Amino acid sequence: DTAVLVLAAGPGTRMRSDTPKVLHTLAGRSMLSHVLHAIAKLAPQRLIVVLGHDHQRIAPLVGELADTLGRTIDVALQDRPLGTGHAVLCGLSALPDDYAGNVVVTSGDTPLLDADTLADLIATHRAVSAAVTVLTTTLDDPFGYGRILRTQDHEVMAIVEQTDATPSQREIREVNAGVYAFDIAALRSALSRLSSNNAQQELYLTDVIAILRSDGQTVHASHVDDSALVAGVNNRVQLAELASELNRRVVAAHQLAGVTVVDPATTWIDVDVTIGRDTVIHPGTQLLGRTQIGGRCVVGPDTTLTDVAVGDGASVVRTHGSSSSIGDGAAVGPFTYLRPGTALGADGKLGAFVEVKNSTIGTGTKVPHLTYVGDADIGEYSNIGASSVFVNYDGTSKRRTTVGSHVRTGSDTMFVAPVTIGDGAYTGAGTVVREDVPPGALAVSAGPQRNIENWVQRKRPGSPAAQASKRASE
Amino acid sequence: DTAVLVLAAGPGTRMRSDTPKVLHTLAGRSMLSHVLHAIAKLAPQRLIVVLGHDHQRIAPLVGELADTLGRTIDVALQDRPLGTGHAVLCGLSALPDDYAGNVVVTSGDTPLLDADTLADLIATHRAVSAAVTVLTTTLDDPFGYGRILRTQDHEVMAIVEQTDATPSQREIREVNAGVYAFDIAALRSALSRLSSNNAQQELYLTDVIAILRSDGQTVHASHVDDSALVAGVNNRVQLAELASELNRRVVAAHQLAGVTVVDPATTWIDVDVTIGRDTVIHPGTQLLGRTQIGGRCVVGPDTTLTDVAVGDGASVVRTHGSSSSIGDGAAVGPFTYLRPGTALGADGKLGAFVEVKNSTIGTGTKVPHLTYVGDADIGEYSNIGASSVFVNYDGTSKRRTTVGSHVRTGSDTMFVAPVTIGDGAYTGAGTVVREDVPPGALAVSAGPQRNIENWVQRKRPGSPAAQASKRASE
Amino acid sequence: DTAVLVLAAGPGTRMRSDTPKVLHTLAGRSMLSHVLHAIAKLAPQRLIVVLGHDHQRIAPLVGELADTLGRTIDVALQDRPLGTGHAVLCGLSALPDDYAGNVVVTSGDTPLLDADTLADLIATHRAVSAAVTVLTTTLDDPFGYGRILRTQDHEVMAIVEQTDATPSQREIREVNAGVYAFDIAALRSALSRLSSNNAQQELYLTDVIAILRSDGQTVHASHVDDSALVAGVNNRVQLAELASELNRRVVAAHQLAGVTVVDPATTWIDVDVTIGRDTVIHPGTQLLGRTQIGGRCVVGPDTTLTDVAVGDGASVVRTHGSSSSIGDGAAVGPFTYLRPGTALGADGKLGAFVEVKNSTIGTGTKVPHLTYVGDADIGEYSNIGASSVFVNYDGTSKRRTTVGSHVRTGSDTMFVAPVTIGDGAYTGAGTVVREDVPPGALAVSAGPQRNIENWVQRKRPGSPAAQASKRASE
Ligand SMILES: CC(=O)SCCNC(=O)CCNC(=O)[C@H](O)C(C)(C)COP(=O)(O)OP(=O)(O)OC[C@H]1O[C@@H](n2cnc3c(N)ncnc32)[C@H](O)[C@@H]1OP(=O)(O)O
Ligand SMILES: CC(=O)SCCNC(=O)CCNC(=O)[C@H](O)C(C)(C)COP(=O)(O)OP(=O)(O)OC[C@H]1O[C@@H](n2cnc3c(N)ncnc32)[C@H](O)[C@@H]1OP(=O)(O)O
Ligand SMILES: CC(=O)SCCNC(=O)CCNC(=O)[C@H](O)C(C)(C)COP(=O)(O)OP(=O)(O)OC[C@H]1O[C@@H](n2cnc3c(N)ncnc32)[C@H](O)[C@@H]1OP(=O)(O)O
Ligand SMILES: CC(=O)N[C@H]1[C@@H](OP(=O)(O)OP(=O)(O)OC[C@H]2O[C@@H](n3ccc(=O)[nH]c3=O)[C@H](O)[C@@H]2O)O[C@H](CO)[C@@H](O)[C@@H]1O
Ligand SMILES: CC(=O)N[C@H]1[C@@H](OP(=O)(O)OP(=O)(O)OC[C@H]2O[C@@H](n3ccc(=O)[nH]c3=O)[C@H](O)[C@@H]2O)O[C@H](CO)[C@@H](O)[C@@H]1O
Ligand SMILES: CC(=O)N[C@H]1[C@@H](OP(=O)(O)OP(=O)(O)OC[C@H]2O[C@@H](n3ccc(=O)[nH]c3=O)[C@H](O)[C@@H]2O)O[C@H](CO)[C@@H](O)[C@@H]1O
Ligand SMILES: [Mg+2]
Ligand SMILES: [Mg+2]
Numbered sequence A, B, C: 001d002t003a004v005l006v007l008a009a010g011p012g013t014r015m016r017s018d019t020p021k022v023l024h025t026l027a028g029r030s031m032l033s034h035v036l037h038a039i040a041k042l043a044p045q046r047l048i049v050v051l052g053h054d055h056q057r058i059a060p061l062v063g064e065l066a067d068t069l070g071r072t073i074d075v076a077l078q079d080r081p082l083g084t085g086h087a088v089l090c091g092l093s094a095l096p097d098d099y100a101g102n103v104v105v106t107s108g109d110t111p112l113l114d115a116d117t118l119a120d121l122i123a124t125h126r127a128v129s130a131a132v133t134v135l136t137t138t139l140d141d142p143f144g145y146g147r148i149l150r151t152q153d154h155e156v157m158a159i160v161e162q163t164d165a166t167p168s169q170r171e172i173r174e175v176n177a178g179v180y181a182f183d184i185a186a187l188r189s190a191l192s193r194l195s196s197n198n199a200q201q202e203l204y205l206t207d208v209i210a211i212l213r214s215d216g217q218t219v220h221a222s223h224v225d226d227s228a229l230v231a232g233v234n235n236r237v238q239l240a241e242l243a244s245e246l247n248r249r250v251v252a253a254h255q256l257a258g259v260t261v262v263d264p265a266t267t268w269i270d271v272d273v274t275i276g277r278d279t280v281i282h283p284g285t286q287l288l289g290r291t292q293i294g295g296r297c298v299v300g301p302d303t304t305l306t307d308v309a310v311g312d313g314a315s316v317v318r319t320h321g322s323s324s325s326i327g328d329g330a331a332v333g334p335f336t337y338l339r340p341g342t343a344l345g346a347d348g349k350l351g352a353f354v355e356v357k358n359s360t361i362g363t364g365t366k367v368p369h370l371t372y373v374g375d376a377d378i379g380e381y382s383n384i385g386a387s388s389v390f391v392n393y394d395g396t397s398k399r400r401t402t403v404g405s406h407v408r409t410g411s412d413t414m415f416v417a418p419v420t421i422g423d424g425a426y427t428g429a430g431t432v433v434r435e436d437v438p439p440g441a442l443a444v445s446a447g448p449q450r451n452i453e454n455w456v457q458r459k460r461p462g463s464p465a466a467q468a469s470k471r472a473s474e
């Protein structure tokens, strides 16, 4: 049995944000959410998040994740950020006084941390009967991290913080990941002996290592080769680095599963996105939220999709869209804007400079150019001519349009809702449609063409046009 | 004299694709095509591709390349993938039984392999009178590759496959490139002695090394410092890595020749693309197929061009286009879509939200905004007003429009083909042009403006508009 | 007291450009301009730029920077590029013959060089009373650079040029940065003894080191750990590398100050750009020139902004724009084109496929779709319907439109300037507005809808439309 505590009550100063650190996102999830998904996979008996003065903005997101993960997540409050050691005391207060399981401590800012690394930590801690096992790694740039002090035999003696380390300790490149397993009694005991006598003037959880070494307890440091899994995030440079690294891993997983990603460095794929076999994702693409792509699709470059379902064989190129679905075999783009509530049927087409909002568009139906579709239902195998608008707003209110199947509407038609265009109807180029159109009818409104001869010589003489026109007489 | 065999009959399982591995593209060519271009530059006497159960989809592409490279390329069939050693036996069957030239073996999945490396391999093999010379390299991550076994004197003893290697052999970082020169007799002899007694249960070409060492033949391994040249591709992660590396080399070549590429990491340049001196390519650009850019052009960011010819001094910004040509000094973009058959004359302009298909557009002519040009011929120094459409499709059929020179067509004109607009003609804003327009004439159709006074107070009271309008009385 | 000489008179052959090297830009400044900003921060007494045969195109930019930096910058002419040693003699000619301050020499192609490194160089040179102090660094790839010759005690003996170096000297990885401090007398003396007897056949400034060592003068080489600060640019590959590295540093500075940059590798930020706290910049974005972004903005991906001011809380997504301003809380994009002279008020909206030029657009006013706004003034809380055009050009001349406040103009309105639309006015869908519209009036022009029944059966039989329409009878 084990309790996991997640310390998330620090002020996050180096982020320089009014958004609490923990809540900063990479790959579709907040760091906190990443940390909690990871721990919930491990299924510990207790899971406690220690929150600080902004608990009121985080505690509710904690409940949301508790509900998603199908479990109970407690919140402990740390009313002043007196240090990671103090934070752990707060977290302990949320366990029974006689709790006898192991205590794993982790941070809310170690977003790649994964259930396997935590299970390994707990297994190791048990195998060697440690009073404390700490995870460590070794980095080229160790700046900011606690340094792991070891004798030549590899026994850990202490951890020393960046701010308290001599120039010589600072050369150490093995660092504290801030991820620990503890025997509960040993932890409580050593926490009670902590002193704020140090540079930052805090109660350091890291002191517990040297304390327990002194007591003659067993102290184990377990080295994590894959540094990324235990990398922290204290500022926005580190956040983009880990987002980038997490993204590489997500992209590689999709590649090994049969998805061709032309340029992984510029293809951002959120963690819940699924993509079918043999799809091709061109550079500059973001697939966000719960986006789902079928198999054999082309995801045209420079495409951003958030919560969009794309069926098999579809093509989605230079498109910006969200909360929409794109049927099998449909063609979308280039330069297309899908707003929430777009439903494009199989083999449909939304072409260049087309914007769709809250509209359903039947099988086989094409909106190829320069057109706005708002609040409409359009049937099957219909064609909406270029440069048209579904006028869904009269000033003051929202109005609906219904277009039948096999319709051909002429270029530059304005559908002034509410209006219904019957099956097989046509609308001439340049029509303002204010009344219903019966099935099979032609609707027109433009007046007759009138050619005014010699207008150019008479109203624009001797413009380049008047001269060209005079040459044409000959 | 030398015969080159290219083994391309394996199943490509780790690609997880219904597209045969060899046929996967980087930089405008299939890997197979890359491998064959490289070999054909070397001009060997015989060149044989060993194909497997999907030979019917590859053999024809082989003929295409034979025809392009001006040479004969034979195909040998391997009806079951029994191993690289077995594959080479298949390839040999396509040589005369008394062939006495050297045999070079290579894979169809080593797409950076180049004629210089192959010529070096053949020269070395000859200089040392080896029975077999194998190319090797050394990598940070040797996973998947055969390991090169050498005594402390650097003599090669054997090659051992990833799957058959002890944990200790796996530490070796010098790997088999899968690129060999053989004395024909030595090869035939050693191939006949191969055994399927190993992890993968195949006839390994790699065993030939240890076999010939045992026979007391001369065995040479030649180390290739530039690893990329001999890197293989077994899955889509490795394919994107080599595409990325190949792309860096193509971009650097254009840079050293006088082309400023703002961000090489995001500029994808196919191998046949040519670009003139002092052009600037902004980030996010792909130049594909047989695209040709003149000198002093600007290739606006986020541009994708496939088979597009761009003359000197042109500007092509945020544009998506294919099979089109863009004259000297023309301006295209931002947000412009060129479909096949676009011909934009010198100093022409295709502006924002303009889409052109199958149209010729004369010198000096401008289509600046929000417009669709389909199946049209437009003369010189003409201006097409904003928000216009060449209505090229009547329902049921494709129709053509001809526009003269020095024309000025008004905004929101619909050209309902087939129609001809004479030289120097104008068309008022809002015109639906259904009849020919004589040179120098003004064509109009919109009815007269009618101002209905007090409509807002009476039909939208006291909307914000009614209130504003009531304030304006005062 | 110290004089800084900047050698910028070489021919820049390896750039293969008709644009003089020095004038090639990264991050919004020419390399020369970068070098001069850096030196002017140091505030030396004299600053002299040595120019060559293209002095006439550079000398004026030098005056511009002199004027911006609030100082005097002299130009010395080198009429033939006889070598860096000869160049320095030219530069000296612009100092009094009795000048007694230190001479710092630097290149015009070391664009990351910074005032701190130069101050350190001068302090070191003084601390050790050197006759010459040279800056050096150590690189993985030392190709092209002079090699630093040192005895085992670390005393510098000489510098040897790439072209004159034995294969063994070429293994040296410590290189000359081309950045020197000199005692003036020692420099003049050693320059007079230079010989053109070497591969390139030039007067090498680098020979001065071995000369002064021989004289028994003190010679100091000061090692710069951060190589980038002293990296040179001789060709366009090196220029993109340093632009990339400079960009990383600019982006990291904004990140540490509170700006979330999703993908630093694809976010290009010029050196004068400022960005407020908690803004988010999505991938593919360039912020150029004097662009200024407020706090809490979203800079939608694929956005390019040059000299654009964006207020707080604004959103700017998939937008291409320049010389424009975007008010607090405004929404711009996706797919929007801002031309010079755009002023979008607070809470304004410019939506998808909208292009604006030289127009002022009041608080709260919305141009949501498919529309061109040219040469217009539009008041507050107005709405411009979809697919509209401000027709600002009559053929021959530029015309202005004024639109009041709280106006609602219908879709597909053409504003044929000059025209004024009064407060609270409406314009029906499909209107060509040629006359002024009074406050509160409705302007229309389209003719009445006419439904021609059975047109489809009679003019398109038995098209799919005729069949659908016949089915609808039942
Ligand atoms: C998206 C693209 O880029 S192309 C795709 C979608 N399409 C289009 O714009 C197709 C547009 N085509 C048109 O508007 C055409 O003029 C068509 C199909 C309606 C005209 O068909 P037509 O049969 O050739 O001539 P027709 O004589 O039958 O039409 C009869 C009546 O309507 C009129 N009329 C025809 N088109 C229009 C129009 N666009 N506006 C106003 N009136 C019109 C006539 O003037 C005629 O009336 P009348 O009997 O007073 O003369
Ligand atoms: C792309 C851009 O953003 S701008 C570029 C391209 N251009 C345009 O849209 C320019 C548009 N301009 C127009 O339509 C203008 O009204 C112009 C140039 C035709 C009007 O010119 P005008 O000479 O000022 O007035 P004019 O009195 O001569 O025209 C005469 C006839 O056609 C009419 N007419 C003029 N413009 C139109 C029109 N757009 N629609 C219908 N009828 C019109 C009159 O009502 C007049 O007929 P009448 O004699 O019954 O009165
Ligand atoms: C941007 C978007 O996607 S939506 C946003 C901006 N908006 C729009 O396009 C809103 C467009 N709406 C329209 O054009 C509408 O027809 C409205 C609001 C003007 C019509 O309002 P209405 O009050 O319903 O009918 P109404 O009877 O009052 O208008 C009266 C007169 O003008 C006419 N008329 C109305 N709209 C138009 C029009 N678009 N073109 C020509 N004439 C028109 C009538 O035919 C009537 O004249 P009459 O008295 O001969 O019959
Ligand atoms: C003294 C200490 O522990 N330092 C460790 C901490 O450094 P680091 O400087 O990263 O410590 P932080 O400031 O990030 O705080 C640790 C975490 O605990 C929480 N918190 C912090 C302070 C507090 O008073 N209350 C509270 O709840 C914060 O949410 C934070 O996420 O993690 C590093 C790895 O990431 C380790 O190398 C360091 O050894
Ligand atoms: C046993 C063997 O040779 N392994 C080599 C092979 O590994 P690797 O595991 O890459 O070998 P592959 O599975 O790629 O097969 C080699 C190539 O030969 C062809 N093929 C393969 C099997 C077959 O039965 N018939 C056939 O024609 C395939 O098209 C393939 O392209 O290349 C590596 C470098 O890339 C080398 O380091 C390995 O030493
Ligand atoms: C002989 C010499 O000095 N070589 C140095 C030079 O190499 P490198 O080959 O880069 O020297 P360059 O050709 O760049 O010339 C140096 C600079 O001086 C100016 N110039 C050059 C030649 C001339 O006749 N007149 C003139 O004014 C040029 O503007 C140029 O910017 O810089 C390198 C670092 O960047 C150093 O490692 C080399 O030791
Ligand atoms: Mg931290
Ligand atoms: Mg009309």
Ligand SMILES: [Mg+2]
Pocket: B107, B109, B232, B233, B234
């Ligand atoms: Mg392989």
Ligand SMILES: [Mg+2]
Pocket: C107, C109, C232, C233, C234
């Ligand atoms: Mg240089």
